[PDB]
Amino acid sequence: PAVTYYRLEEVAKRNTAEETWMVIHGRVYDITRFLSEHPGGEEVLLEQAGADATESFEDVGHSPDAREMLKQYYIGDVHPNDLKP
Ligand code: HEM
Numbered sequence: 001p002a003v004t005y006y007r008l009e010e011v012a013k014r015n016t017a018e019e020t021w022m023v024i025h026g027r028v029y030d031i032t033r034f035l036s037e038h039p040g041g042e043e044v045l046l047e048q049a050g051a052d053a054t055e056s057f058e059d060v061g062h063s064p065d066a067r068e069m070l071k072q073y074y075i076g077d078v079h080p081n082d083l084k085p
Pocket of ligand 1: 057063065
């Protein structure tokens with residue numbers, strides 16, 4: 001298997017609108033092209049760019065179709081040494 005791994009400090013650098021990455025349940029998503037398409041707006045995503053956004057994502061109560069959309073933006077897994085307990 002060719003799984004690509006990123007450290008959290010690499011993800012932390014894509015925190016602006018020119019290249020926007022986010023972590024959700026331990027996977028890294030490049031959502032740069034989705035910013036303007038997101039139904040909840042681009043601001044709530046930029047506030048969380050470069051970070052683990054799992055709790056906000058789940059707190060909103062996203063639909064099954066929103067979960068499906070993730071797959072388009074998947075680029076890699078968070079290195080296991082950087083995942084918290
Ligand atoms: C990058 C992965 C994300 C995707 C693919 C995504 C997708 C969507 C989609 C499709 C909707 C429409 C309603 C639904 O189907 O549930 C939506 C609504 C919304 N999203 Fe996201 N979202 C993402 C991340 C986030 C994050 C990190 C936040 C921050 C808290 C957020 C906040 C919201 C809000 C507030 C709404 C409006 C809720 C409603 O009234 O429908 N989303 N999102």
